[model samples]
Target: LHYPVTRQGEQVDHYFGQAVADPYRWLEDDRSPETEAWVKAQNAVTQDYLAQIPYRAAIKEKLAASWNYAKEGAPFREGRYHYFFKNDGLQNQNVLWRQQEGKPAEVFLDPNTLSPDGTTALDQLSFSRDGRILAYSLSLAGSDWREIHLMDVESKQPLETPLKDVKFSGISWLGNEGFFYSSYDKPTDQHKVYFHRLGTAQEDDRLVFGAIPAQHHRYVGATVTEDDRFLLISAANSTSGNRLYVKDLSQENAPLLTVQGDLDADVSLVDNKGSTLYLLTNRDAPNRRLVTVDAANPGPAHWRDLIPERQQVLTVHSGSGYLFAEYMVDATARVEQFDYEGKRVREVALPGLGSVSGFNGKHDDPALYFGFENYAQPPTLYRFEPKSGAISLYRASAAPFKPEDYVSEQRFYQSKDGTRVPLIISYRKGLKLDGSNPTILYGYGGFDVSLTPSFSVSVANWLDLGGVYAVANLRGGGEYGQAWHLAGTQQNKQNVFDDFIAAAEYLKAEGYTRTDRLAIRGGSNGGLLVGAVMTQRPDLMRVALPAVGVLDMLRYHTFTAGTGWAYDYGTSADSEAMFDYLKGYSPLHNVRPGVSYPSTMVTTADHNDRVVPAHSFKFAATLQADNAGPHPQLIRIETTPVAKLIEQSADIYAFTLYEMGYRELPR
Candidate 1:
């Protein structure tokens, strides 16, 4: 394999009295011309290899066919119009539509028109109290940075100057007058909340937060109650826990009051009935529970439990004067409704065993909508009659694949420490257990993220192509609860890698796939999983796909918002012991000279500011230099777009099978 010549440097950094060599450190300067040239050179090598495969185009077409289906989002009532997002087959972005009672839905906002290639995506949306104004945020080229705009709902016209330099924000309207949003001053990275009034310049936006150290957090967001009576400001130094503050907007000059002063637990405002405030918290209960407190004295000591925590993890939503508690039992959803007075209503029977979301609406809303989906089927929207507990189908999925043709089975496998981990395997119904099928094992075991069964076009194509897809619910996830999450953080991070490796071994033992026919894949934190596992046990799989991964554990905290992830991955600067633990399994540091790694393709986007492309760049350089195997080691730096994603997927699938010695499509 003719890999790109990535020049090494003499850069070194001392971490806790240990000198660490960073040969490819120049790749971190993404703004330099040399780094740009390196990106182009690496892309050329990867594309040249993928283009040589004959069945690559065939897989690309099959993927296109799988993705070419009409998709619609659940509808919501805003003022006098019903708004929903819909996408025509092969459309770059979903178009927002508005409909009246007896009229055809009209195209409200077409994000595809915002850019020539439809790379600009709609990120966030919030409507005013009366639903007369809509504030939406847009992201360019798949970057996390956002630009917010306001539009008059009735007239479909611009309302005010657009807000810029916004990232990790929420738009909560304070009636029709103004709304609160959060953004950081780019130069200082000081995250602050601001108020934007209708028909006003963004420069004149009032500073609603960031006056003190507590308010200046790494991540800050604001939410207004359903009645628009109180504004809740949540400040978090990291991604896991938060400190909540409340201000009564019903009264003028109301001072900001602290509800939860410490960041030990996660808490958020749910709703309120006058002075009685409802909140969803995981303070004492790791599974979480709903509690109520008076706004006049909203403190942890004065709080009373409304819906106590059960064995399953609970996530609450409010609509139509009722609370919907969505319990995650073994990575599946079970919803139950409750009245504002804490009386349990009927259990909302879902259509099937899958994930359920979006049971939220205005307090006076008569009907609510939710979506249900699993590995075999696409999402179908359903309307629920809150008063009578009747759920009827509102919109069925229009994907071309037949759900009945596929079968999904869940199995519990033992990890290295004897911890039982859940693994879901999905494939065509007639799959034989001969250990000959090519399989892809995917996982993301950090950040309290639950790996539930969700439908995807790429996975559908894989199944249709006689390949197997499996997802592992490992220890670092929120599948079991916060205790499960805590077991995979910091020094426990190796538990995540062990669980992933065990899943691979389980597949081979169950006669589903062998090491030569298996691939390990993940993105971001999951990407880190693939890197660690492939470097640790390269002989376990045939290919490794790490997309936009945090490969350099030592320097990850120095990037934008990367410090927020310190809760899960303790930074290298924390202590000597912590730094040593991270360096032990860190992919960038773990690579050994003359070691045979799995056929690898590291992927990232230049516009990806969240994780940044430097991680992929450095990891690929190190792997290429040290890899002793004849198999290809490549890096793909993508310029983001929906079409480009399809192309990249084609490249990945082609690279995986081609290295597995598949010269033609598997029959």
Candidate 2:
């Protein structure tokens, strides 16, 4: 009944009955030595490719015109604003600290202008409470080891005190002469908090807290109180559930304020006045709730619920007696502030924002600064005042381009099995909705990720080239919620492909693009999305781009650093159910010989030690050998010295634009 035959009844058995067969067999032989050898060989090829690519040189050249585009959050010291950012067009990579007040921005620390003995990279920067000294970490090649250097703020001179082997980050000054820092044990990843004093080696190094086992947990969050007496740490267990703890430096043993418990809670120290701690926990629901706990007498009974969770709270930032909580509802972010008592709630409104990416506020200031952007909009800075409920636009990241010139709209579609998905569509305004425009559809439907509204400069090039850009918020993503993620992962992996197909259909139905004019793109997990869509519906796309993508689901579990991903992609040996699901959509296994496919470009980095590049290399090699397509199936194995961090290079960008028939206007 399952055999491929000419009869209609036999065809039903061939399709449906074959679908019911064991899909798990492909993963049974996944861990063989041949698979490991293949992965290693692929890595070697990628590394050789990356060694030849000159990425740093390209960045240095591009940084010349884009030097001023780099900006940072410079907090004020005695009403003076100071912040650090990279500045290029100079002889060397210059780290500049600028001050604002009516005076011109000054370059406080220029690595290019540094003396022979001075460090090359400004790894970390922090200001003292009195603003008299600036502590910064200096390192070469941005590695594990770093040296802490203190500089007198007034004279801009390096202090005599220099600390080395500061393996951890998040530097905070206890005072002008003393500071608190965290470090982890070598090879163990266990963290320890320490206090260091200037100009002293003896009786100065004090171990604060080391009770938390380094192996069992990882420090997810850490912050120093405004008073500088207590250090708050948030550690997550193996399940990635977080718990808050407090360590008092003044105490002899650095006692734990909140005892570790089964309940997962995220805590923050709001003020040092009465040992009041702000805690957000999901004791009741997955969504967090705000609670106040006294550090002096910390216990479950002593914890008082302040802001109970009615909805999912994404983030909370405290200022003085006011607490600002950012809540997510139906993909929209709303910021609201309340007094310490959780009363007098005030909603702070923002303007010209399709979405707010980030927000920050000073301790004393009522004005909250935020960064907002959308699919068609570049990042724009906005200042909101809670007192008057007013919002003001400060600046846009890119000045020359106007967002309104491009047209972008949101869309929703249903999958083959009746799952609704959202898609963001963007193109030049007044462009025809006829199915003729060249379209690039992008999607990443895994890892509980939400394709939030964020701007991209590179996307502008697509619009300029008369290309329509569509981002599909498919299942296996956190767009709608956790349920959405479940719909596209594990046993239901086929839903991701269906969701992407639905997005393409929606685009074609709405006259945004036709099959011949469409190109599908995704990277990493997104690369998997693109691979699945391309293999399933090769006829629907003109071009297929799977960058640093995971193509071989069966082999991914055995590759370098791939064991940890078993949580997301179940091991075939343990879960026959998952293996059945994975083999069905595994791109490498699903490729059919003698079938026409679109022109495909497989991109990979030599130094991508995180995601094994062998997946792409093997898939490309196999496809090239077996594909009967008339179109080109070129594999663009880009090599760069930068390794894992593959920034879009001018050449790569130009090649991409050229592939899509884009031309730049004369300056």
Candidate 3:
């Protein structure tokens, strides 16, 4: 493959004592003509190779056949009708449906109609407290930036005035008066929360929080209580901790109640009753616990333990005057009920071992809806009544795919440090216990995010093509709560890579797959995981899939919203030790010219201001410059779900197969 000649720049970056030669540094500038031309040149080279794959079209055809299934979301009550999101077969995007009691359903919002090629997506939809007004945000081409539009539920028409530049927000309605949303001034600045009144220009919106220019808060969120009596604002500089403040909306100029002025741990309100507030926090407990506090005397000293921390990681939600505490038991989900007084009610019985979400309903509503799904099964939605402990099936998916053809099971393995890590492996039922099968190991070990077992059509397609898929519940995740997450972050980050390497080793040793057919893939922080592991041990896998990875860790804190991630990754400016730590494994810097690396597909997007595309751009350029092998190094930028994903994964599978010595991808 004759790769595009990426012009090497003379730029050199010095970090304390080390001077790094950054020849590909010019590719970091997204606005430059040189970057644009280089992108086209590289895409040309990549496309010529991918287009030559004999059965790439056939893989996409198989994906399309298995993907054409009508999908539905849990029915939710809004205004005088029940609404749910649905997609008929191979629709580019899902359509929102609304129906009155015993009446025919009508279309509410169709995101496909928002754009000709379905590049626009419905990012969020939030209803007013009384369900009279709806505020929904839409994004163009998978961008983090979006515009919020208001609609009268009764009239079924959008308001003329639209809120622009709304990002990283959940529209919290404060009665029928207005709603709170958050956004950054520039794409790189501090985020602020603003309240927008109905039937008013967005320019006239009031800044509710984070208005001070001197403030260095990376993020701020404003949430109103269920009764609209209290407005709480959370300000944070990183992923781990936040400063929480509250204001009783019922009182005028009531001094902003500082519940916690320091960013030590996460604290969020669970529910509130008059002057008393219930908070689920991880301040004193790693697994988190519930606390009750008075609005009049809002302080940590004035707080009383409502429900103490449990052995398992706890996540609680409130509905129908009851607090439901959902625990992560060995990465599987379990829910227990509690009364207002913190007495343990009966446990909520689940179907089996899988993830459970969506315990959603208004506080006064007696009924709540939750959805459950596992690796082998499609999502099943159910309605639960808190009063009677009765549960009824709302909707069971009629997917074209069958779970009976697949095998799903979990196993425990020891990491490098003797820490027990859980791994869930799934594949076709008829597969042999041989090491020759093609396998893909996936992991994301950062940001306190949990990697639970869930069904994916794409994975099903891979299984159909004789592939073994495995997900590693590594450290730096919320599976076992804060301690588990902390174990994989900052100075302890090497533990995450060690956990992933152990996962790969376990797979190979258990006769799941051989070294050459095994592949590793991860996205975002997980992308960082893939890049890190692949560079550390190139022989670990045959192919590498790192999507939107934080590859350039030394300067990662210099990009848009990059400094905000200092919690998970301490910045280069932090200290010489920290700088040395980042530079030690930084993918771009570690690429050796004579080393033979795995066939890699680095994915990112042009609209990605979240992590930014320069990370992938520079990484790919650096990889190509350092490569001395026959393996193909490529990049695929545009990101999405379903239709676009089918095509993307088809190309990805084709690339993986081609690398695995399949001259043409048919089977």
Best by TM-score: 1
Per-residue lDDT value at 452 in model 1: 84
The models' CA-based lDDT, in order, is 0.90, 0.63, 0.86
Better of 1 and 2 by lDDT: 1
Q: What is the alpha-carbon lDDT of model 3 when measured against the actual structure?
A: 0.86
lDDT of 3 by residue, 1-667 (tens): 8888888889998988779888878778876898888888887887788987887888999888888888899877877889999988878888999999999999988898888788898988989987888989998766678898888888889765678888778788899898998987632467888888887777788877786764458788889998999998898988889989999889887768888889989999888988898998998899999999998888988889888998998898888888999999888899988888999878999978889988856777768889898888888899898988799998888776677888988988999989999999998888877898899999999999998879888888888888899999999998998999999889889999999999999998999998899899999898899989988998788999999899999999988878789999898889999988888887777888878899999887754778878899999988888888888888876634676788788889988887887775424
| Higher-ranked by TM-score: 2 or 3 | 3
Clashes of each: 0, 5, 0
Model 2 C-alpha lDDT per residue in residues 487-600, reported as the tens digit of each score: 766777788888898888989999988877778888898888888888888888787889889888866866654554554566555555666677778887778878787877
TM-score to true structure, per model: 0.98, 0.75, 0.97
lDDT of 1 by residue, 373-464 (tens): 89998888999999998999999889988889999999999998899999999998899999989899999999999988898888888898
Instruction: Give the higher-lDDT candidate: 1 or 3.
Output: 1
Candidate 1 TM-score, C-alpha based: 0.98
Quick one: ranking by TM-score, best first? 1, 3, 2
